[PDB]
Structures are given as structure tokens and as C-alpha cells.
Amino acid sequence: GCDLPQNHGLLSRNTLVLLHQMRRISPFLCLKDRRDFRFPQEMVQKAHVMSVLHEMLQQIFSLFHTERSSAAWQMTLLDQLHTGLHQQLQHLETCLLQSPALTLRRYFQGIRVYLKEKKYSDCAWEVVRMEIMKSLFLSTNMQ
């Protein structure tokens, strides 16, 4: 089996804390730019538990590495977001020894599109970050 470093609960947390600290405007002003993203809550089987997780972070990674993301978030907090997403991914994926991941991804496309629509706006960006944070929390009820 795979045993994460004792300090991985500490890793998944630091992502949430960053996603928090990246907040730019008052989520009030954006209650108009809201949207149900239809997250696949039903998810959250140890092997699955890891796939779904690795499934998600890489996506969170992919979504916040964008040319555009770099233009709506202070760069410092991007780099540490990215550093702690890679380090989580890296030793999770080290366990490559031996609907599902697909619902997760259609889900993430929505977010990719929903933005293109709302035209990479300030509020559009909050909505996402915030949304991501929820989903991550939910995700994070897996230890």
C-alpha cells in the first residue's frame, strides 16, 4: 500500500488556506455572478479515494496554471498554491503500484467554460476560487 508522509493532512490544508488567502474582492459584490456547478458530491474504497483525489488536484492545478489565472491572482500565492499542489500530487501519484474520474472532469470543464462566458471577470474568478474551495473541503473529508 501507499503511506503518505505523516504530514499530508498538513498539505491538503495549506492548499485550502492559500485558496483562502488569494481572495481579492468581497464575495458579496458577486452574488449576481453565482452558479450551481453541480459537483459530484456522491463521491465522498481506498484506491478510488486516491484516484478521485489525484484526479482533482491535477485539475485544480491545471485550472490555476493558466495564462489567465496568472492575471487574476497575485503571483506569490499562485506559486505556493502550485508548489503544494505538485508536492501533494507527486507522492500521491507515487502510488502507481499494482462516470468515475470522468464525471469529475466534465465538472471541471463547466468551470473552464463558465469563466470564458462570464469573460474572465473579477467576480467570475472569485466564484470559481470559492467554488473550488467548497469542492476541496468535501474532497478533504477523506483521511
Binding site: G9, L16, S26, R34, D36, E131, K134, F137, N141
Partner: protein, 190 residues
């Protein structure tokens, strides 16, 4: 300018959104509180507890049961036939909420001590109850297993005519600091 600032903590197991005002010339008299969320696009509910309250705080223990959602809230204060101002803010319970220690008593015996932790009888978070036993230089942390009104953990294998100090406290996470219960000390019968 004018800024409202909010404290959200769990006291006696009751969530409690408080708030203070800074740089307000005319301080209101009554406040009303609204909150919504971001996940689905609803409209502000109006907390009934806290509609038109004189007190500078609210009891959200029944409206905000989810750790994994983000609650955005509008406070407004009226001082006369008027709406003085309206500020906003949001909270993530998993981050913003402080967790006050519960009430506890201890009772000294020959070979052991008896901590009774007075919970209430009635939602919940991923918290862990610590009971901390301080002797000379020593400090054995005790975390018992899973809130039922009075709760009794038994500190055992203790040396008589020795002195002990009990501290109690809930810790949501390693990272976030923890509030410790005031110290209570007894002496074991010989």
C-alpha cells in the same frame, strides 16, 4: 471610513457570530442579519433570531450547519426611521471559527482523577477532545473517544499525595492554534 468586523466562534457548542463597529459616529440601535451561500444562487435568508436585535451579535447554530460551504452575510443597522449602513463579509467555518473549551470539573481520588466534561444533550465538526494532565514538569495529553450531556473520562494510574492540574480543550486542527481551558487543580488522597 466605516468598517464592521466579525468574530465567529463556537461557545458552549452554539455557533456565535458577533461584530464590532469602528469609526462610526452614529452607532445604530437595531441590527438585522442576512446570510446566503455561493454554491447555489439563492437569496439572502434573514436570521429571525437576529432580526431587529439590540444586542451586537447572533446565534447561527441552526442556520449554518455546513463546514464545507461559504456563508456570505450582510449586516445592516438602523438607528431611527433609517438604514444607517450595510456591510458584508463571508466565513468558512473550517477556517474562521474558533472553538472555545467546554465546561469541566475534576474530582480527586487515591489512585486516579475524575474529569467530567459538561457537554449538552442534542450537527458536529471534526474536533477532538483533549484532557491535559499536568504534574511536576509533566503533561500527559489525553484524548478520549467519540457529546452526551455530562461526559466522564477517567485519568488513571495516578500517584497519591501527588498534585495534578487538569486542562481541557477542543482542537479542530494541528495548524490553527487552540484555546485552553482555565486550570483546575486538586490533590490526591493518600
Amino acid at each position: 471610513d466605516e468598517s464592521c468586523t466579525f468574530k465567529i466562534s463556537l461557545r458552549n457548542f452554539r455557533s456565535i457570530l458577533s461584530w464590532e463597529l469602528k469609526n462610526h459616529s452614529i452607532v445604530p440601535t437595531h441590527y438585522t442579519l442576512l446570510y446566503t451561500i455561493m454554491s447555489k444562487p439563492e437569496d439572502l435568508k434573514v436570521v429571525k433570531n437576529c432580526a431587529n436585535t439590540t444586542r451586537s451579535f447572533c446565534d447561527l447554530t441552526d442556520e449554518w450547519r455546513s463546514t464545507h460551504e461559504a456563508y456570505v452575510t450582510v449586516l445592516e443597522g438602523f438607528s431611527g426611521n433609517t438604514t444607517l449602513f450595510s456591510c458584508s463579509h463571508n466565513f468558512w467555518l473550517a477556517i474562521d471559527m474558533s472553538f472555545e473549551p467546554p465546561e469541566f470539573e475534576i474530582v480527586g481520588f487515591t489512585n486516579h482523577i475524575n474529569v467530567m466534561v459538561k457537554f449538552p444533550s442534542i450537527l458536529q465538526f471534526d474536533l477532538s477532545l483533549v484532557i491535559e494532565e499536568q504534574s511536576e514538569g509533566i503533561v500527559k495529553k489525553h484524548k478520549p473517544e467519540i457529546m452526551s450531556g455530562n461526559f466522564t473520562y477517567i485519568i488513571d494510574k495516578l500517584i497519591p499525595n501527588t498534585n495534578y492540574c487538569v486542562s481541557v480543550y477542543l482542537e479542530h486542527s494541528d495548524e490553527q492554534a487552540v484555546i485552553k481551558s482555565p486550570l483546575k487543580c486538586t490533590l490526591l488522597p493518600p
